[PDB]
Structure 1
């Protein structure tokens, strides 16, 4: 499954761009698993695409208000910070070229 690999990747990004606090792999999975259940993420890689970021935020916000469940929103806040960091701080395609180069 794409799923447990995406947890790895995200967990990597947070250790690097996640200043201070960082979330647990349990917490990241919880976020992801919910997002799949709620029908937002069709595949867990779709979360890297920025198209999805505003929608997610909105939806996890609703959840904190309506159902009083904010744990996953907190995760997403940390996580998104890392994604944006990473997008600004690097050239996207060059960083990918590097990874596939190592692949052999």
Structure 2
């Protein structure tokens, strides 16, 4: 389904643009599903839009501060790094 396809795209991007630090597919899935739970994303593909990136950081930051749950924030740090790197690579090539 779309959820699994997005996890696989993100995993691949992370391998290319992070490397050794890459989060596992289930960690990416936990982060993505939590963001859906909190209403930040409708479709899992909404994560790809640069317009969602600051809202996601804010929400996961808030979760760490209020619940002491920072796992998803750490995963996002890696995912966002890879997404920014990918976008920047596309920008400079285009």
Q: TM-score range by the shorter chain?
A: over 0.9
- Structure with greater Cα Rg: 1
Q: Taking structure 1 as reference, are residues 45 and 92 closer, same or farther at Cα in structure 2, changes over 3 Å only?
A: farther
Quote the residue 2:26 is aligned against.
Answer: 26
Structure 1 stretches (4+) deviating beyond 2 angstroms? 90-94
- Cα distance, 1:20 vs structure 2: 3.5
- 3-state SS in 2 of match to 1:91: helix
**CA 1:28–1:91 in 2, change beyond 3 Å: closer, same or farther?**
same
Instruction: Structure 1 unaligned segments of length 5 or more: list them.
Output: 95-104
Q: Where do 5+ consecutive residues of structure 2 fail to align? A: none
Instruction: Summarize the Cα distance change of 1:48–1:92 in structure 2 as closer, same or farther, 3 Å threshold.
Output: farther
Higher relative contact order (CA 8 A, sep 6+): 2
Higher mean alpha-carbon deviation, 81-90 vs 59-68, is at: 81-90
Q: Any idea what the Cα deviations from partners look like across 1:15-63, whole Å, max 9, x if unmatched?
A: 1011441100010000001011111100000110000000000000000
CA distance 1:70–1:17, shift in 2 (3 Å):
same
Indicate the RMSD between aligned Cα atoms, in angstroms: 1.7
Deviation at 1:91, TM superposition (A): 4.4
Deviation at residue 89 of structure 1 after TM alignment: 1.4
- TM normalised by structure 1 equals 0.85
Say how many residue pairs are matched. Answer: 94
